[PDB]
Write a protein that binds this ligand. Structure first.
Ligand SMILES: Nc1ncnc2c1ncn2[C@@H]1O[C@H](COP(=O)(O)OP(=O)(O)OP(O)(O)=S)[C@@H](O)[C@H]1O
Ligand SMILES: Nc1ncnc2c1ncn2[C@@H]1O[C@H](COP(=O)(O)OP(=O)(O)OP(O)(O)=S)[C@@H](O)[C@H]1O
Ligand SMILES: [Mg+2]
Ligand SMILES: [Mg+2]
Lengths: 333, 300
């Protein structure tokens, strides 16, 4: 009897809010299909498994950070290339002023359709991000280095002058504005960031990132990338052994890691991952340094085994399809 | 009307730490901490525990980062959990007041006070200065809500993010966003921190968490709570039922070996909590003992 005017006051309050601030201001979370988690590929199968939901989330903020020459730019060009192949539009804000367009083409990016900007200030860089996000016409934005987003007062001033907290304040104001717009247009924003040392530290890690604490909070995924070794063809160094740690995840369980090769000119070695995952799931048998598929001996060593999968497109498609079926938590098709 | 009503936090260790046995209804609560401390997980645990008692709940996601699948995994009934995603900071607080006035919802949660951007700052440019507009907007909202919340008997939980003060020599350099109005009006104030990992040998499957009560108008403040948040599954209330059982000398622990009523239960905490899962009888009767010994005022 008394629990019914409860439901009436609810429906009346819902009617009041939904006509004041527009149609879908309040809903029920189980019914809201704008709140579901769509993803896009990173260009690494191992990293797609480590992220749990099978890729990077659309409508969210992502941070990639690491030491120098660890593969941060290369990893973000591989996600742009994969999204372009699925008929999406992409932008690249190059605050570092260090993008080589010929290398981007070799990694598989469509250079003629990628929107590029080299802004003079951090305010200009974050105002272009907002304008592209609100447009609804751009799916993936990459900002290359938070560390190079310098406020206008610091550009106008002299070297030595103190502007303490100014960059951190600029970033804190930008996150507030962007987070809403990005979700509304279903646009993925990737911030690359550099590492700095904190002085006078006995306890914990001395490593930190630039641009303050706001980005750590607003980010849905945070990735730590590191170069853990060289890839050699005799004495020639031909690429880099790479490890990625998922330090923060809001769409799945964190603290999983991914290992892969970056080969200079080609980018991420896809078939190299396909072997290592095939070996792990008992689809490829390893007899010391002899790889074999269904008894049929494919090669001697990982490089020859990878070279074999390259000249057998049908056999590689078969193994990919199974590894995908097995290790993907919730395959959506 | 001024007699206090409480609802469970989901964690038993935190229910003892507050003293009254939960968060007070018709009041304002603040829950701050660093990155990935378990602020959202704790407030979805409250909503879950509340809507199991036949209550309606709302979630105002200003952060734009709520996963409905994870909410269901923690035990939130998402089919009748009200969710809003406001564009401005003013919309978020007008929806909070409109829901409070109606007298229909019992619990409201505003995720990130840091993300409540004033209208003027949104249609402005990045670089433009709006000194204290967030603090005024919050100060206006608090004096308008405090009265409307009490007569409705509606709980409002604000989640806050930590920022750092520049050129401070004294005290702690940590701050909270959205002014010092919320600091005054807030009845309870929790400070969550991740203090370690929970492993399956090497595989990291959880977070060792510590909650501190820095303010309490309802009971004695400056008490602690320690517990485990597992990634999916949610809060580990069996893991607490052992830790409080051994603290009151109902359970015994001899190194890595557990024993209750003479007969041993398992080796380590993971096997000890796994046996409590398989024995609802002892898990019922130990809950009985821990509650009736450490309850401040038994309602009925
Ligand atoms: N244009 C190129 N031609 C050949 N190799 C390249 C080229 N650009 C980058 N690489 C290599 O690819 C590996 C990863 O480079 P990046 O992706 O540029 O890493 P990064 O972390 O962005 O480094 P920064 O911005 O310079 S600190 C490095 O060993 C580079 O030398
Ligand atoms: N959907 C999910 N699936 C699995 N684990 C999760 C999920 N969401 C969060 N977690 C983890 O649970 C722990 C607590 O997360 P939260 O409750 O979101 O904490 P938080 O302080 O709200 O973090 P923020 O909002 O990003 S500053 C973290 O270690 C997360 O990685
Ligand atoms: Mg680079
Ligand atoms: Mg949160």
């Amino acid at each position: 009897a008394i629990d019914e005017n409860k439901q009436k006051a609810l429906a009346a309050a819902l009617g009041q809010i939904e006509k004041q601030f527009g149609k879908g201001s309040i809903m029920r979370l189980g019914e809201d299909r704008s709140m579901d988690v769509e993803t896009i590929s990173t260009g690494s199968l191992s990293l797609d498994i480590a992220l749990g939901a099978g890729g990077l989330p659309m409508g969210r903020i992502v941070e990639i950070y690491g030491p120098e020459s660890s593969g941060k730019t290369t990893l973000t060009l591989q996600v742009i290339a994969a999204a372009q192949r699925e008929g999406k539009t992409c932008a690249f804000i190059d605050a570092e002023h260090a993008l080589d367009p010929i290398y981007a083409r070799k990694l598989g990016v469509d250079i003629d359709n990628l929107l590029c900007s080299q802004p003079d200030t951090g305010e200009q860089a974050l105002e272009i991000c907002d304008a592209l996000a609100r447009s609804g016409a751009v799916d993936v934005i990459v900002v290359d280095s938070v560390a190079a987003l310098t406020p206008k007062a610091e550009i106008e001033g002299e070297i030595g002058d103190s502007h303490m907290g100014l960059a951190a304040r600029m970033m804190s104001q930008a996150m507030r504005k962007l987070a809403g717009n990005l979700k509304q247009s279903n646009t993925l924003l990737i911030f690359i960031n550099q590492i700095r040392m904190k002085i006078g530290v006995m306890f914990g890690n001395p490593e930190t990132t630039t641009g303050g604490n706001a980005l750590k909070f607003y980010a849905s995924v945070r990735l730590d990338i590191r170069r853990i070794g060289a890839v050699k063809e005799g004495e020639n160094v031909v690429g880099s052994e790479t490890r990625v740690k998922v330090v923060k995840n809001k769409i799945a369980a964190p603290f999983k890691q991914a290992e892969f090769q970056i080969l200079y000119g080609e980018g991420i070695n896809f078939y190299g991952e396909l072997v290592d995952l095939g070996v792990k799931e008992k689809l490829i048998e390893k007899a010391g340094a002899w790889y074999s598929y269904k008894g049929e001996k494919i090669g001697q060593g990982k490089a020859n085994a990878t070279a074999w999968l390259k000249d057998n497109p049908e056999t590689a498609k078969e193994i990919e399809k199974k590894v995908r079926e097995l290790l993907l938590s919730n395959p959506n098709s």
